[PDB]
Amino acid sequence: AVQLQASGGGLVQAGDSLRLSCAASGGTFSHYAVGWFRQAPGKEREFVAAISWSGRSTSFANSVKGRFTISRDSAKNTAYLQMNNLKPEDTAVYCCAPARFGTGSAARDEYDDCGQGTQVTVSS
Amino acid sequence: AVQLQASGGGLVQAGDSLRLSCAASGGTFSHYAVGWFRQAPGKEREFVAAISWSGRSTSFANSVKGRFTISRDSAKNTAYLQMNNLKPEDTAVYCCAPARFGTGSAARDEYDDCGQGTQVTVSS
Amino acid sequence: AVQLQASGGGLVQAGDSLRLSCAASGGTFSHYAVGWFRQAPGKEREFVAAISWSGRSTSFANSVKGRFTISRDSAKNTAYLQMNNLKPEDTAVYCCAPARFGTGSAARDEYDDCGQGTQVTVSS
Amino acid sequence: AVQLQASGGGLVQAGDSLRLSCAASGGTFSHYAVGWFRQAPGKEREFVAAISWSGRSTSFANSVKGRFTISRDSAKNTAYLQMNNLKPEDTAVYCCAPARFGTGSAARDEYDDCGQGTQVTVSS
Amino acid sequence: AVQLQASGGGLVQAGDSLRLSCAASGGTFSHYAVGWFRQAPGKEREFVAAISWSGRSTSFANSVKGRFTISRDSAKNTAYLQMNNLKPEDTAVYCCAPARFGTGSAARDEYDDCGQGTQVTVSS
Amino acid sequence: EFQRKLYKELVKNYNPLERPVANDSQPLTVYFSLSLLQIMDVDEKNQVLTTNIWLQMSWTDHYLQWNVSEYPGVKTVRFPDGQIWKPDILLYNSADERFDATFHTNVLVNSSGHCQYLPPGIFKSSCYIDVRWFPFDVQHCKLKFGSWSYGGWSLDLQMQEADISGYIPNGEWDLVGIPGKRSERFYECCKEPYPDVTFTVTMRRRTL
Amino acid sequence: EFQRKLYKELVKNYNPLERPVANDSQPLTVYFSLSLLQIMDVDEKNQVLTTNIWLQMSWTDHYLQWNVSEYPGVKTVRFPDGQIWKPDILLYNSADERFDATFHTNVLVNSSGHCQYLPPGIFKSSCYIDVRWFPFDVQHCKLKFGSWSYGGWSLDLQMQEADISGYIPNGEWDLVGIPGKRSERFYECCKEPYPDVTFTVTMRRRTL
Amino acid sequence: EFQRKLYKELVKNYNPLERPVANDSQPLTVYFSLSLLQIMDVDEKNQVLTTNIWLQMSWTDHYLQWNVSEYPGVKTVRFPDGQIWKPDILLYNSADERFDATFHTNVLVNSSGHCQYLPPGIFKSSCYIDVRWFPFDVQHCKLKFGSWSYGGWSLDLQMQEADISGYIPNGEWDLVGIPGKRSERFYECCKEPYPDVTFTVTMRRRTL
Amino acid sequence: EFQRKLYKELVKNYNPLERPVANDSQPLTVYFSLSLLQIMDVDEKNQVLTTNIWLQMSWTDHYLQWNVSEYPGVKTVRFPDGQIWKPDILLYNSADERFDATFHTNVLVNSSGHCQYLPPGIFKSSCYIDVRWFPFDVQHCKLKFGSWSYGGWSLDLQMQEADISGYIPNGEWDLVGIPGKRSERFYECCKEPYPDVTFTVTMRRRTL
Amino acid sequence: EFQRKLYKELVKNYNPLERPVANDSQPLTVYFSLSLLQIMDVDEKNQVLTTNIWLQMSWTDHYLQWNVSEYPGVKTVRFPDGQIWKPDILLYNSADERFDATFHTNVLVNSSGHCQYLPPGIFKSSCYIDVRWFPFDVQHCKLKFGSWSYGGWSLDLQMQEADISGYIPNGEWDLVGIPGKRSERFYECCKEPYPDVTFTVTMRRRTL
Ligand SMILES: *[C@@H]1O[C@H](CO)[C@@H](O[C@@H]2O[C@H](CO)[C@@H](O)[C@H](O)[C@H]2NC(C)=O)[C@H](O)[C@H]1NC(C)=O
Ligand SMILES: *[C@@H]1O[C@H](CO)[C@@H](O[C@@H]2O[C@H](CO)[C@@H](O)[C@H](O)[C@H]2NC(C)=O)[C@H](O)[C@H]1NC(C)=O
Ligand SMILES: *[C@@H]1O[C@H](CO)[C@@H](O[C@@H]2O[C@H](CO)[C@@H](O)[C@H](O)[C@H]2NC(C)=O)[C@H](O)[C@H]1NC(C)=O
Ligand SMILES: *[C@@H]1O[C@H](CO)[C@@H](O[C@@H]2O[C@H](CO)[C@@H](O)[C@H](O)[C@H]2NC(C)=O)[C@H](O)[C@H]1NC(C)=O
Ligand SMILES: *[C@@H]1O[C@H](CO)[C@@H](O[C@@H]2O[C@H](CO)[C@@H](O)[C@H](O)[C@H]2NC(C)=O)[C@H](O)[C@H]1NC(C)=O
Ligand SMILES: *[C@@H]1O[C@H](CO)[C@@H](O)[C@H](O)[C@H]1NC(C)=O
Ligand SMILES: *[C@@H]1O[C@H](CO)[C@@H](O)[C@H](O)[C@H]1NC(C)=O
Ligand SMILES: *[C@@H]1O[C@H](CO)[C@@H](O)[C@H](O)[C@H]1NC(C)=O
Ligand SMILES: *[C@@H]1O[C@H](CO)[C@@H](O)[C@H](O)[C@H]1NC(C)=O
Ligand SMILES: *[C@@H]1O[C@H](CO)[C@@H](O)[C@H](O)[C@H]1NC(C)=O
Ligand SMILES: *[C@@H]1O[C@H](CO)[C@@H](O)[C@H](O)[C@H]1NC(C)=O
Ligand SMILES: *[C@@H]1O[C@H](CO)[C@@H](O)[C@H](O)[C@H]1NC(C)=O
Ligand SMILES: *[C@@H]1O[C@H](CO)[C@@H](O)[C@H](O)[C@H]1NC(C)=O
Ligand SMILES: *[C@@H]1O[C@H](CO)[C@@H](O)[C@H](O)[C@H]1NC(C)=O
Ligand SMILES: *[C@@H]1O[C@H](CO)[C@@H](O)[C@H](O)[C@H]1NC(C)=O
Ligand SMILES: CN1CCC[C@H]1c1cccnc1
Ligand SMILES: CN1CCC[C@H]1c1cccnc1
Ligand SMILES: CN1CCC[C@H]1c1cccnc1
Ligand SMILES: CN1CCC[C@H]1c1cccnc1
Ligand SMILES: CN1CCC[C@H]1c1cccnc1
C-alpha cells in the first residue's frame, strides 16, 4: 500500500520456523500486491514469493515451493510470510515490495522499489 | 534550482543532532523539489527524504521517519535537513538532487543527477 | 513452460559425460523454447545451447559446438542437455530459461528470467 | 569533432597548474561541444567541465568551480582545460567527449562515448 | 556472418607482430561488418578496430591508430587483424562481433553480442 | 501537487485491452441512454433520417479508485480516447458512408470508479417513410444500438429512458415520443446471444 | 486477475508482420463469406450499386492459444487493428473514392486459436444496368473480393454461402439470389496464381 | 544555444492530462472571445449559417515559466497539439458532419506562463430563418460555445467582446452587432453546473 | 519458425529515409508502368477525366536479401507502408482535392531483393475536351507521373508499356490506345533535370 | 555506406520544435513564392476561386551541414513531415472546409544547410466577382499568405516573383498578371507586428 515495511527477522536454528510481517501504509492496502525478495550477502536480489491483490493467486520459487507460505490480512494491512524447516542457505535480507493490482507473478517490471528489509540468519 | 550543492557534514557522536544545508544556484529555486540520498561506503544509493516544490508534501524513509525533518527557505534558496539522535549506521555520504515541480516522492525517475555530497561519520 | 527448473548437477571427472534435465511446470511446455546459460564463479552469464519450440532448430556456442547436444521430450515436459568429454573450464552453474514460441537463437531479449540452476564441477 | 583525444597528463606537485589539450579529428570541430570527465581509481565517472559549440556557454562542477577554466581554439581544433591550485584528490584519468551542437550542460545523454584519456597524479 | 569466432591468440614478446583471424559461419559474410573489442583483465570492454561490410570504410582507436590494420577476405569468410610493435598494455582478450550492413563505426548499438574471444599476452 | 501523483499512480500497470471487471466470471453492466436535440432533416426519396443526438454510457472500472483524503482537492479525473477501456457501441442501421459518426471526447471518472461517456454526434439512419396517407400519417423510425464484439456473458447492456428536455421543436414535424426497448438476438456467426437497444422516433407531419 | 496475465503472456514475441502459420511451407486457409442487409440504392446513370454488407473472415492463428484450466473465467480475447495479423481482402471492382470502405473492428479469438473478423460497411461497386427490357428485366451485379498481396501457395481462400436472414426487402427491387463462385486467375505482374470469390446480386425490377 | 536548453527544461515531468493549476482546489480561469471575418453563406431551406471565425482562448499554465535573464534572446515558445493541456471548447449547436470544424494550430506562451490559442475555422451552425417579413426582417442566429468535460469548480469561463475590425461586408446581408452573454446551466447527466457563452449575429436583409 | 527470424534479421539497422543504393554515387533505377481497367466517367463541363488504374513500380533494395537455404520455406516477404523506402511518384495534373488518390498497400520482396509495388486507385485528372467535331472526334487526355523530390542523378525512371488486358469496354467511349513517352525537363526551382512519364488515353465517341 | 552515417549523425540532438537559428536574437529569413498552373474554376454565385498552385519556401537551417569530402557521393538529403522545423505558412482568405489544402511532401537540404519546400495543392479562396460590366470587365482576386504563430522579430518573410512559365491557358478567362506585395499589420491579439504576402490574379473575361 504505497509504502511497505518488513519486520520479524532474527537469529534462528536450522530446522525451525519463522514468521515475517510486511505492514502497509500510505494508501489502500487492498489495491496492491505484495512480493518478497532476498538480497543475500554477496549475490543478487532474487524473487521468493508473491500474492495477488485479492489473494486468489500465489507464486513461489523452486527452492521454497514446499517450505514457505504467504497470507494476507486487510484488517491489519499486513502480509505474512511463514517459513518452515529453515536451512543454512536461507540466511539473507528479506525485503517487501508493492504492486498496484498485481497478478502475483515473478515479473520484476510490475513492482516498485523495495524498502529497507530485515536480516535473518540460520545457524547449523 | 538547476544546480544544488550540499554542505554541513562532519564528525559527530552517537545521540547528537546535525543540520545539513543544500543551496541552489543556476535557476529559480521555487520551481524544483529537493531530494536527499545516502551513498554509504560499500552499499548502493538510497533515498532518505524529500519535499515538494511548494513545501506542502513531504516524504521520509522508514528508518528515518521519526528522527529526521526537512524544511525549505526560498529567501536563501536553501533546503535544510535536521537529523536528531544519530546512530552508528548513519555514517555515509549525503547528496542533494533537484526535481522540476516534483511531488516530493521516492521515485528516482523524476530527479536529476546528484551533485558532490558531504561525508558524515558517527562514532559510538 | 512458464516455470522451468534445472537439475542433474554434480561432481564429475575430466573426460566424462553428464546429462542435465530441465523440467517445465505452470503451463503448456510445447508453446515455449528452452535455453541454457552458464554463470561461472567470477564471470558473467553466457549462452550455451538452445532449441526451438518445435525441435526443428538448434543453436550452440563455439566451445560447446561439438561436445554438447540438446533434445526435447513433451511426454515428460523435459529438455535434456548431454555433455560429453567434459573439461576443467566447464565447472559452473547451469540455468534453464523459457521463451514463448522462440526460434532457438542466442538473442537474450526473447527469453524470460532464469530460475535457480544446478552447480557442476569438473576435477582434473 | 567526431573523434576527440585528450593529452597533457603527468605528475605534478600540490598547488601547481596543469594544461590539458583535447584535439579533434574526423569531422568539423565547430559543430560539436566538448565535455570533460574524471574516472578516478575506484569511483565512477564524474562530469568536470563543459563548453558549448560556440563558446558562449560554459559549465563547471562544484569542487572545480573556482580553480578550473575551459577555452576553445578552432584554428587548431583543440579545447584547452586549465587547472590551477591542484589538490591531492584531483588524481584521476581525464577523458574528453564530443557533443553535436551541444549546449555545454552536465547532462550525459547528449554526449558520445569518451575516448582514451590521460592519467594525472598529484603528490602532497 | 551471424556467428563469428576469433582465433590466433598466444604469447608474444614485446615488439613483435601478431595476426588474428575472425571466421564467419551461419549466414552470408558479405552482408555484415566486423568489429574488434578488448576485454582486459580488470577493465571494461573497449573498441579497437572496425571495417564496413564492403571494406571501403575503416575505423581505429587512438592508441592503435598507427600499429594495427584490418582486412577482409570473402573467399574464406574471414577478417584479419594485424598488430605490429606490440606493447605490454596490449595483453587482453580480443573478441569479434558482427554488424548487419554496418558502416564500420565505433558505435556499440549497431553490433550484436560478441562471441568467445582469444587471450593474448605480451611479455616485456 | 496531487493531480500529477494521482495520474502517475493510476496509469501504473493499466491495460486498455482488458475489460475492467473484478471477477472475470461475471458480465460487466453498462447503462445506455440517448438524448435527442433536433431532427435536422427527414429525407423521403433516399429513406434517410438525420438527427442530432448525445449518447450516454455509464459503467464502473474498479481499477480507477483512490481515497480522496490522501489526494485533497481531487475528486474527478478525465481520460482521452485510447487510454482506457471503452464499450464498442455502434448503430446497426447506419446510412453514413463512415458508418460511425460519433465525435470522441474525454471519459470522466469519480473517486468510486464510475465512468461516464457522452459523445455528441449527427447520426444518419435508414428509415422507411410511407406517403400513402400524405396529409395525415405517423412515421416510425427505429434506431438500433449494440455492442459489436462483446456479447452476452461479457457485457450486460441495460437501457435508460431518453431525455428530450433540450429538444428544439421542428417547423415541419412533431415528435410524439421516443420509446425504447431492450432485446436479445442470436446470429449465425456465433452461438452467444447479443443484446441490443432500439428507440423509436414517432414523428408526425404538420398539416400547416 | 487472469485477463491481465493472459494478455501479457500472449503479447510476448508476437510480430504482426508474420503470417500465423506453423510450417511456413503450407498455405494458410481462410474462409470468406458475405452478409447482405439492404440494397440502399441502384444508380443507372452512373452505373453504381450501393449496399450494406458485413464481411466474414475465419482463420486460425496457432500463436494465440492457452489452457482454460490455468486461466479460469477467460474463454475469449479481442484484439484491435494493427496488433495481430489480418488478411488483406479487398474488393476489386470498387467505385468509392477511398476504394476501401470497411470499418475496422476487433478480432475475436477463442481458446483454440480460431480468429473471426466481421467488418460492416457500405460498399459502392460498378455494375452495368441494361434498360432495353425496361418493364421486365433481371440485372446481374458482381462483387469480386480477393487478397491483394497474398497469392497461391501462401493463402488458400475458401468460400461460404452468403447469409440473407436479416435482409430488408426493398420497395423497388426484388432479390432472387446471391450465388457465389471461387476462381483462380493469372496476372501479368507475377507468375503466381491468385484466387478470388465473386458474388452475384440478381435483382429484378418491380412492375408496380 | 538557449532555445534547446529551455525546451528540454520545460518538457521535464510535464503531463498533458493535468490541468495547469497551482492549488487543485480552485478553478482555472479561461477567457474566451470570437473574431468574425465573413458571413460566407446563409441557407434558408436547410436552416444553416456558414461563417469564417477565429476563436480566442487565454489562460495561464504556471508550469511553463523561466527567467529571461538566464535564457537571453528567448521570450516566447510555441507548442504543437497534443503536447500541452488545452481547453476542450466546443460549439453545441453544430451542423457540420464532423461536428468539430476547427484547424489546430500552435499555442504561444510568454515568460510569465500566459497561453493564447487562436484557431481559425469555417463553422456551420443551425439557425432558424423567418421569412414572414420577407422584404424587411432582422434574423437572430445564436452560436453557443462551452467546455464539454470541464464544468464548474474546475474551469471558470469568462467572456470577452467580439472583434469585428477585419469584417468584410456582405453583398446581401448587413450585420447590426454580435452581442455576447455568459450563462450557467444544469444538465440531467451531472449535478455540477456548466457555464457557456452565446453570441448573436443580428443579420438584416438588404432591400436592394 | 524461420519467418520470425528472417523478419528480425532484416529489420536490424534499417533506415526508411535512406535510398537503397549500394554505391551512393549512381542513380537507383525504377521501372514504372500503368494498368487501366475502366473509364468510369468523362466530364466535359468541368474538364475532368475519371478512371480506375493500378500503378506498377519495380526496383531493387540490396538491403533485403537472404539465402533461401538457411530459411527453408520462405521465399517472399511483405512490408507495410512507412517501414521501407518507397518512391514518391505523383501525378502532376491531378484534379482531386486530396491531390494524391492512391490506396497504399504492402510491398513484396523476393530473395534477390526485388521490390514490386502495385497500388490501385481512382484518379481524377484535368483534360481538355473539344466538341467542335461533336458527332466524330478523337480526344487525347494526358496523364503525367513523376518523382516530386528525387531528380536526375538520384532516381532513373524507366517506362514500361501499359497493360489493357483486363480493360472493361465503355458503353459511350472507345479506347484506341494508351501510348507512353518518357521526357526530361528543367524547372526554375532547381538546376537538376527531372524525368517524367506521360500516357495518352485516345478516346473516341461512339456515334450510336 | 555513407548515407546511413550522415543520417544518423544529423538526427542526433535535433529538436523539431526549435527554430533553426544560430543567435536566437535575430529573425530567421524565409523567402516565399508562388507558382500558378491552372485556373480550374471561377464560381460567381458562391464567390469562390479554385486554382492549382505550388508554394515555394526557402530558408536555412544551420543544423543540417556536413563536409562533402567526408561523405563522398552524398550532396543532398530529404526529410519527411514532422521530423524537422517547417514554417507555418497559411492562407488567410481560405474558403475550403479543411481550411488548409496543401499536400505535405519532403524537404530537400544541400550541404550548406539550405532548405527548400514546394508543396502542390488546389486552393479555394473567397473572391468578389463584379458582373456590372458583364461583356467587358477585369476581376481582381487576392490571395493572402502569412505565418500564423510566428510574427516579427522571429520570422522575416520576403517575397519573390511568381512563376507562370508552366501556366495552362484557360478557355474562358485570360490572365493579365499576378503582382505581389509584402505588407505588415497589427492585430488586437498581440502587440507584435505580423508580415504577410498578397498576390493578385487579374483575370479577364473572354468576349468569345
Ligand atoms: C461516484 O459516482 C457514483 C455514481 O454516480 C456514486 O455511487 C452511486 O451510484 C449510483 C448509481 O450507480 C447512484 O444512484 C448513487 O446516487 C451514487 N451514490 C451517491 C451519489 O452518493 C458514488 O457515490 C460517487 N463517489 C463519490 C461521490 O465519492
Ligand atoms: C474454438 O472455435 C473453434 C472453431 O469454432 C472450435 O474448433 C472447431 O472448429 C470447427 C471449424 O473449424 C467447427 O466446425 C467445430 O464445431 C469446432 N469445434 C467445436 C465447436 O467444438 C474449438 O473447439 C473452439 N474452442 C473451444 C470451444 O474451446
Ligand atoms: C506575459 O503576458 C502576460 C499577459 O499578457 C503579462 O501579464 C499581464 O497580463 C494581463 C492580463 O492577464 C495584462 O492585462 C497585462 O498587461 C500583462 N502585463 C504586462 C503586459 O506587462 C506578462 O507581463 C507577460 N510577461 C512578460 C511580458 O514578460
Ligand atoms: C527475384 O526477382 C527478380 C526479378 O523478378 C529475379 O531476377 C531477375 O530479374 C529480371 C528483371 O530485373 C527478370 O527479367 C529475370 O527473369 C529475373 N530472374 C529470374 C526470374 O530468374 C530473381 O531471380 C528473383 N529471385 C529468385 C527467384 O530467387
Ligand atoms: C546550397 O545551396 C545554397 C543556395 O542554393 C548555395 O548557397 C548560395 O545561396 C544563394 C541564395 O541564398 C544563391 O544565390 C547562390 O547561388 C548559392 N551559391 C551557389 C549556388 O554556389 C550553396 O552554395 C549550396 N551548397 C553547395 C552547392 O554545396
Ligand atoms: C466469480 O463468479 C462465480 C460465478 O459467476 C463465483 O462462483 C465466484 O465465486 C466469483 N468470484 C469470486 C472471487 O467470488
Ligand atoms: C481514507 O483515508 C483516511 C485517512 O487515513 C481514513 O480515515 C479513511 O478510512 C480512508 N478511506 C477508506 C475508504 O478507507
Ligand atoms: C511442411 O510441409 C512440407 C510439405 O509441404 C512437409 O514436407 C514438411 O514435413 C512440413 N513440416 C513439418 C514440420 O512437418
Ligand atoms: C490443462 O491443464 C489441466 C490441469 O493441469 C490438465 O489436466 C489438462 O490436460 C490441460 N490441457 C491440455 C490440453 O493439456
Ligand atoms: C487552495 O484553496 C483553498 C480554498 O479554495 C484554500 O483553503 C487553500 O489554502 C488553497 N491552497 C493553498 C496552498 O493556499
Ligand atoms: C532573474 O535572474 C537575475 C540574475 O540572477 C536576477 O537578478 C533576477 O532577480 C531573476 N528574476 C527573478 C524574477 O527572480
Ligand atoms: C560508384 O560510382 C563511381 C562513378 O559513378 C565509381 O567511380 C565508383 O567506383 C563506384 N563505387 C564503387 C565501390 O565501385
Ligand atoms: C546458401 O547456403 C548454402 C548452404 O551453405 C550454400 O551451399 C549456398 O552457396 C548459399 N548461397 C549463396 C548464394 O551463397
Ligand atoms: C545576436 O544579435 C545581437 C543583436 O541582435 C548581437 O548583439 C549579438 O552579438 C548576436 N550574437 C552573437 C553571438 O554575435
Ligand atoms: C572538408 O574536409 C577536407 C579534408 O580534410 C578539408 O580539406 C576541407 O577544408 C574541409 N572543408 C571545410 C569547409 O573545412
Ligand atoms: C453481434 N455482432 C454484430 C453483428 C456481427 C456480430 C459479431 C460477432 C462476432 C464478432 N464480431 C461481430
Ligand atoms: C494479385 N494482385 C491484385 C492485382 C495486382 C496483384 C498484385 C501482385 C503483387 C503485389 N501486389 C499486387
Ligand atoms: C456538460 N456536457 C455537455 C453536454 C454533456 C455534458 C457532459 C457531462 C459530463 C461528461 N461529458 C459531457
Ligand atoms: C521537380 N519537382 C516537381 C515540381 C517541384 C519540383 C521540386 C523540386 C525540389 C523539391 N520539391 C519539388
Ligand atoms: C497573426 N495571427 C494571425 C491571426 C491570429 C494571429 C495569431 C497571433 C498569436 C497566435 N496565434 C495567432
Author numbering:
A (entry chain F), B (entry chain J), C (entry chain G), D (entry chain I), E (entry chain H): 1 to 124
F (entry chain A), G (entry chain B), H (entry chain E), I (entry chain C), J (entry chain D): 1 to 208
The authors write:
The human α7 nicotinic receptor is a pentameric channel mediating cellular and neuronal communication. To develop a novel class of α7 ligands, we recently generated two nanobodies named E3 and C4, acting as positive allosteric modulator and silent allosteric ligand, respectively. E3 and C4 bind to a common epitope involving two subunits at the apex of the receptor. In this study, we solved five structures of the α7-nAChR in complex with two nanobodies, unraveling a common epitope at the apex of the receptor, which is formed by the MIR and the N-terminal helices from two adjacent subunits.
We then solved the structure of α7∆ICDcryo with a 50-fold excess of the E3 nanobody, with and without 100 µM nicotine, with an overall resolution of 2.6 and 2.8 Å in the ECD/nanobody region, respectively, and low signal in the TMD. Five E3 molecules are bound in a similar arrangement to the one seen for C4. The E3-Nic structure shows an ECD conformation very close to that of C4-Nic, including the five bound nicotine molecules, consistent with agonist-bound conformations of the ECD. As seen with C4, nicotine binding triggers a small motion of the tip of the nanobody away from the channel axis. First, E3 harbors the “canonical” disulfide bond that links the strands that just precede the CDR1 and CDR3, which is missing in C4. Second, the CDR3 of E3 is longer by two residues and is bent upward by the presence of an extra disulfide bond between the end of the CDR3 and the second β-strand of the framework region 3 (FR3). In addition, E3 shows a unique interaction between the Arg56CDR2 guanidinium and both the main chain carbonyl and the first glycan grafted on α7Asn23 (pre-β1), an interaction absent in C4 that harbors an alanine in place of the arginine at this position. In C4, Tyr60, Ser63 and Lys 66 contact n+1 Gln2 and Gln4 and in E3, Asn62 and Lys65 contact n+1 Gln3 and Gln5 and Gln 116. The CDR3 of E3 also contributes to the interface, the guanidinium of Arg108 lying near the carboxylate of Asp 113, suggesting a salt-bridge interaction.
